[PDB]
Symmetry: D2
Subunit: 222 residues, 4 copies
């Protein structure tokens, strides 16, 4: 039971935010659903500082999937991708660790992307940002293990959510075929399956997981 | 809740068997703790057939870790390793799937070894058998996903258990150093952490996992 | 240059054998193309012993891809799969290592399968055998590194060869679609690309690779 | 033979640059050894544009390994790490692809880091940048495969080179022990082994490799 624990969930209305908030409420936690814009220097530090005590930080972060060929990407599209997905992650982790290290206890979970694990044919700058996320979480988890703090990542794809798999995507035949030929599960991971796994990864039972990346994508990548 | 579900656990007194049985009892399941010897042709089929209805099959299988250099291994040591770890796994999976396919529901979990994922310097025939286990579970999970049956594997090492990490091993300095230099967790995974993860992997929340190998080894392998 | 080196290639008329033999001839090696049946106990030891000095052992091993659902596989089909792919590999490695250890030099390369890395929907017993191969080669490579002997594996799929990708397979529409949706390369790896990589892995330049599995499958698995 | 081919190697005096330049000269290529500072916006585009025809782009990029705990890293140290390792990689790939796509032929090889694959206990911002590199190269390789261009990465560690493994590091006892307990090879990969593998990956024999990450670290990671 995550009873009387404070769980902050970023971009709570987007990506996995809704399901995460529901799931952490049902487990009995005090959920702080942050909707702040995170693009500006210092914004992520501000979210953490405004919250006071954090027991669990769930980095739910997302942008629309860019469609740009790799040679026509601007330096600005690139730096926007990293300003949305990468720089806030670092600000928030660095702001929240000190209190978890002091308490010798705490949970950080990244809701990252399997596009860092299996290259896409059009999301080159998206894939780069998501890879920065995964490698950072790995390194921070190894660091923080020494202090009793667990930092881990989900690497997901083909999960039902409004940002990357809304119904309009699901109706396209390209998606139909991507499921047939690439997803052994043969269906989308439901938002609630994903969020229950997140809850497990933020429980004491999961104190043995430090710096680990868990793929959640119906067998699309293993 | 795994309420009124039948969970069969092989070699229940060895390796992870005790912790698994405790954990599945606490989740409210009817636990069948099998202690049969499995070496003989047909023995594993007999265990499954004697049990009648299986909702969850947990393949807890183990032998002592052999110390033999690769060029001095006999054909008989080899075939004994496979007769203990591999052939019973196949008999039991093939015996239990038909009822799970008919019910369009069921769970198979292999308690396998990370030695299949990171080569050891002396367990060549042990590592081969454990690799057969992992690749089989992968293939069977992809097959059975079509029928609503989830077949997955834990790939573990550095978990507290009497077979591979009894106190005498823990006192040796080679182990002291293996933890220091190879296990980011800095301690053994407890038997109960491992068994709780097994329970989660055999719950409905985990219906999204088919044919997946989950490393459970404190960051020894990722 | 592999000049005046003896390179033994098993099942030389099947799978990658032709291309391997051509490629190792062109690099200037003395190629021993073995066509022996390997099913019987002792057959693989006999091949190695008949050859005298081996500098490079290339374990090219294959059987037809079985089509059997996992629950209808017989114990005999299973043990035949392992008798063709697994037990000869062990006999031959254990027979050839002593002379390589004495010379503090030598190369063993397994031509294995990516089906051990990504579960297939019908090759459950084939996938198990191929996984035993990969995990064994990993463990033996870690052992033999101490002696200056390099033991490695290719894990291949979607390579042009008469056993798994003859023209009749290539014409089917299921294959057409498997390439479209699963092989980033968009074509089969040619036999000569595969064999050149094998030659590189058996050169001195590759003395840094011990117990490593190299996927060769056009991005099907990474 | 890489005869009469132009091969540009970035930071040619640092990291793997010397060995790469020697190795590509010996294979008969016209080597362009660039020593430019790459930190400024547009600098990498300038290097590519000044070179005219590029047949092979070898992204040799490096900075000193930072020693900073994750919670004391400044936003500026972070953005400097990415400005040295990540933003120039993108500028140079996007500048050089158009001519390779037009020629339906070309090679890009990243000299990346296994620290993206196995989290370090102090290089959190270094690990993040190196992960961005690997995921980007993966995505670009999948994109460019359609055009006959091969984009791949080496993910290395424990290679002899002045930047990360100079003699002073090699004498420390922490390194002594890291080899003993973590590197199955039991020695450093030589610079020339690493560079020969780079040359192979930029040859036609390697046209089957698109978007693939090859670990080169003596078995430290697999
Ligand atoms: Cl998703
Ligand atoms: Cl264990
Ligand atoms: Cl193949
Ligand atoms: Cl290095």
């Amino acid at each position: 039971s995550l009873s009387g624990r404070r769980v902050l969930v970023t971009q709570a209305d987007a990506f996995m935010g809704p399901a995460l908030c529901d799931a952490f409420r049902a487990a009995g936690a005090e959920v702080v659903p942050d909707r702040s814009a995170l693009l500006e220097r210092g914004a992520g530090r501000a979210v953490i500082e405004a919250a006071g005590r954090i027991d669990v930080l769930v980095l739910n972060l997302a942008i629309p999937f860019p469609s740009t060929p790799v040679h026509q990407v601007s330096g600005g599209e690139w730096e926007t991708t990293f300003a949305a997905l990468v720089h806030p992650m670092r600000e928030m982790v660095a702001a929240v660790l000190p209190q978890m290290i002091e308490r010798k206890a705490g949970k950080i979970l990244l809701m990252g992307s399997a596009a860092a694990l299996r290259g896409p044919a059009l999301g080159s700058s998206y894939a780069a940002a998501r890879g920065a996320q995964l490698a950072y979480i790995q390194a921070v988890g190894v660091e923080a293990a020494a202090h009793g703090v667990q930092v881990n990542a989900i690497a997901q794809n083909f999960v039902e959510n409004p940002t990357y798999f809304p119904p309009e995507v699901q109706a396209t035949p390209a998606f139909k075929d991507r499921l047939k030929w690439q997803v052994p599960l043969g269906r989308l991971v439901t938002a609630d399956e994903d969020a229950s796994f997140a809850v497990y990864l933020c429980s004491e039972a999961a104190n043995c997981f430090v710096g680990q990346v868990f793929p959640v994508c119906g067998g699309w990548v293993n």
